Design a protein around this ligand. Structure first.
Ligand SMILES: [Cl-]
Ligand SMILES: [Cl-]
Ligand SMILES: [Cl-]
Ligand SMILES: [Cl-]
Ligand SMILES: [Cl-]
Ligand SMILES: [Mg+2]
Ligand SMILES: [Mg+2]
Ligand SMILES: [Mg+2]
Ligand SMILES: [Mg+2]
Ligand SMILES: [Mg+2]
Ligand SMILES: [Mg+2]
Ligand SMILES: [Mg+2]
Ligand SMILES: [Mg+2]
Ligand SMILES: [Mg+2]
Ligand SMILES: [Mg+2]
Ligand SMILES: [Mg+2]
Ligand SMILES: [Mg+2]
Ligand SMILES: [Mg+2]
Ligand SMILES: [Mg+2]
Ligand SMILES: [Mg+2]
Ligand SMILES: [Mg+2]
Ligand SMILES: [Mg+2]
Ligand SMILES: [Mg+2]
Ligand SMILES: [Mg+2]
Ligand SMILES: [Mg+2]
Ligand SMILES: [Mg+2]
Ligand SMILES: [Mg+2]
Ligand SMILES: [Mg+2]
Ligand SMILES: [Mg+2]
Ligand SMILES: [Mg+2]
Ligand SMILES: [Mg+2]
Ligand SMILES: [Mg+2]
Ligand SMILES: [Mg+2]
Ligand SMILES: [Mg+2]
Ligand SMILES: [Mg+2]
Ligand SMILES: [Mg+2]
Ligand SMILES: [Mg+2]
Ligand SMILES: [Mg+2]
Ligand SMILES: [Mg+2]
Ligand SMILES: [Zn+2]
Ligand SMILES: [Zn+2]
Lengths: 85, 91, 77, 100, 244
RNA sequence: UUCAAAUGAGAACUUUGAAGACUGAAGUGGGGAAAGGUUCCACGUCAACAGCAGUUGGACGUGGGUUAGUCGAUCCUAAGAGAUGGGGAAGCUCCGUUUCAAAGGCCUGAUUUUAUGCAGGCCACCAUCGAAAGGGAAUCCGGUUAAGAUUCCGGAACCUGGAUAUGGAUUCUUCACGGUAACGUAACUGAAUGUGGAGACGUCGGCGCGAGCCCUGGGAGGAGUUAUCUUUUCUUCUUAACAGCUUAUCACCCCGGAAUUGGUUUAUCCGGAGAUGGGGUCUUAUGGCUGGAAGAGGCCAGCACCUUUGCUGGCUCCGGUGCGCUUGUGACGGCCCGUGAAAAUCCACAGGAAGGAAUAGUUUUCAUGCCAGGUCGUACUGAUAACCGCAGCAGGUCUCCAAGGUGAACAGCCUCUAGUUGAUAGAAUAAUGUAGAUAAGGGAAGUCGGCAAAAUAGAUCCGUAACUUCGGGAUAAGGAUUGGCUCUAAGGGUCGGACGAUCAACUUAGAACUGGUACGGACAAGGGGAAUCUGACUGUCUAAUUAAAACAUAGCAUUGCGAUGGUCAGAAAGUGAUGUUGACGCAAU
RNA sequence: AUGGUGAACUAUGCCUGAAUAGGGUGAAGCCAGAGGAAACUCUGGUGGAGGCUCGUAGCGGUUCUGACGUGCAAAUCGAUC
């Protein structure tokens, strides 16, 4: 339990403590699935609330699939610029 | 982004079996995995099951065809020959 | 293995001619957010099934115990 | 960390020797042998699963009531509604064409 | 020496056909009154794969003329035949792909398949995928019909023999190389035990007439006469010529 | 391995206690299939056997022990085996399995002499054997013995076959009604015959969900540590078959009519053959609540006592989390010149032969009630001692369950549960060995030959040639970094409507500080480069001296054959293989 | 030479079952973006193919011509593979 608390603080995580590859420690596909589901969940939330229209929603849907936004707030900033013009 | 220059679907074979044999397989592999138009419903939903069997995803209809294509060149000629001879026995 | 929530059908079971034994079980359980109450269960042993009637009101429980047929073998606890 | 064993003489992992782990009122883990899952009856014409029909092993249908094994319509537990609709339309139109 | 490989196959112990997954023998209908005088209509139910056979098979259902039931027939599917299609078989059937007609009731140049050698044997010729028979003549006085076979031979057949209009489906199969030993293995896994093959010159003299020697060679002419006996017929039997 | 006690004539080896250790969940743990056959358990007991010993034992003597309508066998069919009818053969016998056969029996009508003669029709499928892992009607929990249990006891269920009554439903419109529909229900006539479904099915990949396990918070008990510290460390807090209600991705129905094309998966498919959207229907894998059921089981406290051994009390509660592990399952996707059993058996529908009501009948597919369920197997070992190898032999022998940490990990290493602590011992430390190791300077000078050994090794970043079938070569080659500690930055879910509040994951990157410059600190873990001969590759063989360049292989070419046939088998045959085959085929090189 | 017995080992076919951590490489298909008159050409993601590859269980048996060689064993033991 003491060792687990140190790791949650960021200890014992340097290059000398890693024996598997980055993919083995955390698959790239797992990372992609989590963020793409985040982006799609946000888009449906905005559309159902009336904050965005289906025409802009459809465009942003295929941009997120195309790796246009790196995280959630990058999509939000893009939407603000789109709605400010 | 283009991943291979010329091997295409035959990149699964690596460097084995010879370039000429891999080129021959490539031409036939694309045809048998291709999607074809259905003559019954007009949609692009016809794919191959076993060799010579072609089934449409919609309209649930199966047509007997070629080993790697829906219709062979030889079978197309036979249809024309039968049609020409059919009209000579009824008219 | 079967539960009944109607008193009228419970009394019909006690005179079904194939029922010979019954038992009364008293449970001391806590309600949602109040003082503990006594819960009683009436179990009738049929030929094929056991029928359990559960009532949480002690006032109505006393009447039902008295109204049981005098020719039925009733086991208390 | 309690480990379990088979409760029959068959020691192999076949389709008829599948088990599930459950906890008993005695507080210990014990294997539970489970029967193979049932398959829904299929339509005679199109092959799709029939709506409103119970899913059971073949011998179990003799124990359930008829209301669980049929639908209140022609070809109830044999053909689905859409296939029955096609049969009626085809029957009417073809017979009319025969007269003319 | 000992009994050679090709002699052992006749005993049929481990060299029998693997027929567990076969759909059934592919044959036409039995020649009956409706076939020889008129026509009978059948319905294609499904087109299915048959293990050990390149060409697909078609399941066609006919009605029994003499009692109330359905009869199931297994045909070799021609190109263009589809599920739900009506099939007409008989003397008065139309000239359409999939129909079964006598060879004497079709015009010159007709393409047919699953042709009967004799009336009623239910199909003997042109059964493999992509093969067909060309009708090239009629002899009405002698009730004979001249046809061309896939091998190129010319044969004279009775005009009452039946055939199916069209070409056997699945053509072009042999144009794709197997490309590895594994696919050859699975091909013959569902046919018979004839693969892989060991060369005779790699064996010992007790095993094969080509066996032995301090070099791997045949040592005598590989052209063997027709009159040779079992144990001798290894190589090119009764060859008229050799070479490219 | 060690100390002590007990037992005994006798104890390094038996028993008990204490200590030190190991197997470390792909076990030295807990069950089985074959095979063995009483080795199982108790009492007595040591001549022989346990390559020392023996008070001990799988030894010796005497007895005890295996309980089933629900677990298997029995039934079904698989490859295949094999009677009959017939044909061969001097003959023992051979062929063949629906075959040149007059091949057999269940619904009832007709009779009230007695039991089945006689009248239409139905069906022609024509032995039998073949699976303790395939198919398959039906059971669970608690307790109980020296040794038995899903088999005994208590309680609670279920199936099949057979008897029958009541209630309910239905009928004077004779064989039920509701919903536009998908369809719903406590029921709700259906012979011959026909049709369909279930039985019934490959493999791999990621994703969704469930169960058990793992991790963790609060609380109610017990135990351990307490010089000092630790609201601390360990442990108990469980819920079966079955039953009622309810619960779902998919699919489907009604309304509606879409380009400014929309919807939508991690993975691009779907829509005028009707999308999105709104409202409904259904399968019950699965989950929830209740009954079963706290009366059980578990954890504690206060009291009696040689005793047949007990009594009275309480508590047994409420949460969180996930690229976790194992396993089940759903919707999908990839692959084939490979498309991945059969039968018994059960159900539905089509059909409409008969049977049926008014002072009366029918449904045992609705509920309840009654009776019966035979035969054989069942102990134990399952292996460094119960099987086979001449044996208590370091060999061989099919399979299920699988905790914590480190780490990519079912690797190695340490630990918990459980199980062992067995293999003749004591003393000494010569040579030579077997096994494990280290070396100044030189670095293959050794040797047939770098044989053996050493060096390299994880991860992150940088960098990577000739040649090439363009796929590779490639971890080419060649460099740098890696601990600890204190911080910083980025990456999410949900909730009332423009922003806040609140909750919970290890992932990556960076910066200070610190040390005998150490840090994949044990464990784990590639040497590389320039060329020649040869086989293309993966694959295969001389069990017990040869693994290769030998065989095979894809590719290429030649040869025979259209069935009254080619190749091959048989003593013969009314006999066979290819052949459930037909030249894009079979056969022979 | 005559008449018999064996596929419990092993060789090959067939029928019915079962078993096989964790990594590296990144083929088709698909999405977005950039260059270009056009044909088209490039970049970043997604996806997870192969008688591919590192390496456990498993199967096999290269070398030390190691141990043993009246052996534990009429073929075994250890390391390496
Ligand atoms: Cl041979
Ligand atoms: Cl020495
Ligand atoms: Cl070469
Ligand atoms: Cl198998
Ligand atoms: Cl070895
Ligand atoms: Mg990827
Ligand atoms: Mg079984
Ligand atoms: Mg040789
Ligand atoms: Mg010879
Ligand atoms: Mg010769
Ligand atoms: Mg160890
Ligand atoms: Mg240990
Ligand atoms: Mg004993
Ligand atoms: Mg001794
Ligand atoms: Mg002695
Ligand atoms: Mg004895
Ligand atoms: Mg016989
Ligand atoms: Mg049998
Ligand atoms: Mg026992
Ligand atoms: Mg037992
Ligand atoms: Mg023996
Ligand atoms: Mg022996
Ligand atoms: Mg780790
Ligand atoms: Mg030195
Ligand atoms: Mg030195
Ligand atoms: Mg030298
Ligand atoms: Mg020298
Ligand atoms: Mg070496
Ligand atoms: Mg080689
Ligand atoms: Mg490989
Ligand atoms: Mg050898
Ligand atoms: Mg060797
Ligand atoms: Mg060779
Ligand atoms: Mg045969
Ligand atoms: Mg054998
Ligand atoms: Mg062979
Ligand atoms: Mg490898
Ligand atoms: Mg040696
Ligand atoms: Mg020696
Ligand atoms: Zn279509
Ligand atoms: Zn249908």
């Amino acid at each position: 339990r003491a060792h687990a608390q140190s790791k949650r603080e960021g200890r014992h995580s340097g290059y000398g403590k890693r024996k598997g590859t980055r993919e083995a420690r955390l698959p790239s596909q797992v990372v992609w699935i989590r963020r793409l589901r985040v982006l799609r969940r946000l888009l449906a939330k905005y559309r159902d609330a009336g904050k965005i229209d289906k025409h802009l929603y459809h465009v942003l849907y295929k941009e997120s699939k195309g790796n246009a936004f790196k995280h959630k707030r990058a999509l939000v900033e893009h939407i603000i610029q789109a709605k400010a013009d | 982004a283009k991943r291979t220059k010329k091997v295409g679907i035959t990149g699964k074979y690596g460097v084995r079996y010879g370039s000429s044999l891999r080129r021959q397989v490539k031409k036939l592999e694309i045809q048998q995995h291709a999607r074809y138009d259905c003559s019954f419903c007009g949609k692009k939903t016809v794919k191959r099951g076993a060799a010579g069997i072609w089934t449409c995803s919609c309209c649930k209809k199966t047509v007997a065809g070629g080993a790697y294509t829906v219709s062979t060149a030889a079978a197309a000629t036979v249809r024309s020959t039968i049609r020409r001879l059919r009209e000579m026995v009824e008219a | 293995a079967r539960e009944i929530t109607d008193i009228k059908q419970f009394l019909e079971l006690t005179r079904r001619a194939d029922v010979k034994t019954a038992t009364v079980k008293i449970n001391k359980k806590l309600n949602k957010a109040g003082k503990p109450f006594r819960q009683t269960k009436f179990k009738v042993r049929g030929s094929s099934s056991l029928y359990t009637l559960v009532i949480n009101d002690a006032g109505k429980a006393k009447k039902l115990i008295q109204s049981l047929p005098p020719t039925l073998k009733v086991n208390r606890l | 960390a309690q480990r379990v064993t088979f409760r029959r003489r068959n020691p192999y992992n076949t389709r008829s020797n599948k088990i599930k782990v459950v906890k008993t009122p005695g507080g210990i883990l014990r294997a539970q042998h489970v029967k193979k899952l049932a398959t829904r009856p299929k339509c005679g014409d199109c092959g799709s699963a029939l709506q409103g029909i119970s899913t059971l092993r073949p011998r179990q249908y003799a124990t359930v009531s008829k209301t669980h094994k049929t639908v209140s319509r022609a070809y109830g537990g044999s053909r689905c509604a859409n296939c029955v609709k096609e049969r009626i339309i085809r029957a009417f139109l073809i017979e009319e064409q025969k007269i003319v | 020496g000992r009994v050679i490989r090709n002699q052992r196959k006749g005993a049929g112990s481990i060299f029998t056909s693997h027929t567990r997954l076969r759909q059934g023998a592919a044959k036409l209908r039995t020649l009956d009154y409706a076939e020889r005088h008129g026509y009978i209509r059948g319905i294609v139910k499904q087109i299915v794969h048959d293990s050990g056979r390149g060409a697909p098979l078609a399941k066609v259902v006919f009605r029994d003329p003499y009692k109330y039931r359905l009869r199931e027939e297994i045909f070799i599917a021609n190109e263009g035949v589809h599920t739900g299609q009506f099939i007409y078989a008989g003397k008065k059937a139309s000239l359409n792909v999939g129909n079964v007609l006598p060879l004497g009731s079709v015009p010159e140049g007709t393409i047919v398949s699953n042709v009967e050698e004799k009336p009623g044997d239910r199909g003997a010729l042109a059964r493999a995928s992509g093969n067909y028979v060309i009708i090239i003549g009629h002899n009405p006085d002698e009730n004979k019909t001249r046809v061309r076979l896939p091998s190129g031979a010319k044969k004279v057949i009775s005009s009452d023999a039946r055939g199916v209009i069209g070409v056997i489906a699945g053509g072009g199969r042999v144009d794709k190389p197997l490309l590895k030993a594994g696919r050859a293995f699975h091909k013959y896994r569902l046919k018979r035990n004839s693969w892989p093959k060991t060369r005779g010159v790699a064996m010992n003299p007790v095993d094969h007439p080509h066996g032995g020697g301090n070099h791997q060679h045949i040592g005598k002419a590989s052209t063997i006469s027709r009159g040779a006996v079992s144990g001798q017929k290894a190589g090119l039997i009764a060859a008229r010529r050799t070479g490219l």
